[PDB]
Amino acid sequence: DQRFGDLVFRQLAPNVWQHTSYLDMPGFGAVASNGLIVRDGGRVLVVDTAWTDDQTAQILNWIKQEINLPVALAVVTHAHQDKMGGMDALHAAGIATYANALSNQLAPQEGMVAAQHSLTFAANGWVEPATAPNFGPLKVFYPGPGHTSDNITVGIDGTDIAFGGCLIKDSKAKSLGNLGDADTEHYAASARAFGAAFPKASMIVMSHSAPDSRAAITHTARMADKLRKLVP
């Protein structure tokens, strides 16, 4: 695990790294958020920003020093601060940014700055390739509402890795979330859709926990299931 400033990096495969940023906040402590960095031939692809523009810049600085390839594009997984808080740093660096159209639509409402481009999805959940030009091994899937209405998901082709973002909870989590933009009705089915979209992923990377097995997916849907009846 390479430390770089306030960011931590963990190689998950040749060509794939997890980036982790921390939001240092009173009462709680540091809240971790994870994203991905993927080397695809002669360029780098990033999934998710860090919490802040300055932390995101540090990712880019780490990429420069450790990998020394240019960053072609970033995909951002939904319109929350842990995923899109550093969009300005990506834009300032001349990186082409992508998000779900709905994520761009909601961005202003949240405190976020919108990605430059909007991804669109088929009825099957799969991204319309015309809207995701040159994503290389990044396979982008919209599993349905869950953690959020806009949440998207990313598989990394030629690896066992799939990224659930904040949709999939840890195999030992007890809660699905605190905020009313989680879709309690559909969550379980969204969790499962994700699993069905990347049936070969054995390593399941997520926003707030160390990578886990496919048990995270099962656990997350099960939770979602039991809760559906208890929400006031």
In the complex, minimum distance from the CB of residue 54 to a copy of itself, in angstroms, rounded to a whole number: 26
Considering the complex, state which of residue 57 and residue 107 has its C-beta at the smaller distance from a copy of itself: 107
Dump the DSSP string for 61-97.
HHHHHHT---EEEEEE-SSSHHHHTTHHHHHHTT-EE
Alpha helix stretches (DSSP H) within the chain: 53-66, 81-84, 87-92, 101-106, 187-197, 215-228
102 binds a copy of itself (CB under 8 A): yes
CA 114, CA 56: separation in Å to the nearest integer?
Answer: 15
What gap in Å lies between CA 217 and CA 182, rounded to an integer? 17
145-184 footprint of a copy of itself as x/- string (CB under 8 A):
x---x----------------------------xxxx-xx
Picked from Zn ion, a copy of itself, none, the partner binding residue 166 (CB below 5 to 8 A depending on kind) is Zn ion
Is residue 200 part of an annotated ligand binding site?
no
Residue from 35, 86, 144, 155 touching a copy of itself (CB under 8 A): that is 144
Q: Is 169 annotated as a binding residue?
A: yes
Tokens of 15: 């060509």
Binding site annotation covers 78? yes
For residue 80, say whether it is annotated as part of any ligand binding site.
yes
Cβ neighbourhood burial of 36 (10 Å; 0-12, 13-18, 19+): buried
* Residue closer to Zn ion (CB basis): 20 or 207: 207
Which of residues 147 and 214 has its CB atom nearest to Zn ion in the complex? 147
Quick check: 154 and 201 in contact, CB under 8 A?
Answer: no
Please report how close the Cβ of residue 223 comes to a copy of itself at its closest, in angstroms. Answer: 14
- Over the window 104 to 143, marking each residue x when it contacts a copy of itself by CB under 8 A and - when it does not, the resulting string is xxx--x----x---x-xxxxxx--x-------------x-
Stretch that binds a copy of itself, among 5-13, 101-109, 159-167, 168-176 (CB under 8 A): 101-109
- Minimal distance, residue 188 CB to a copy of itself, in Å: 10
10 Å CB burial of residue 76 (0-12, 13-18, 19+) is buried
Half-sphere CA count of 186, side-chain side, radius 13 A: 17
Q: Which does 86 bind (CB under 5 to 8 A by kind): a copy of itself, Zn ion, none?
A: none
d(CA 181, CA 78): 12
* Closest C-alpha to 81, from 223, 5, 169, 179: 179
Chain breaks in the chain (C to N over 2.5 A) after: none
List the single partner that 106 binds among a copy of itself, Zn ion, none, CB under 5 to 8 Å by kind: a copy of itself
Q: Which residues are annotated as a binding site for Zn(2+)?
A: 78, 80, 82, 147, 166, 208
Q: Which residues are annotated as a binding site for substrate?
A: 169, 178
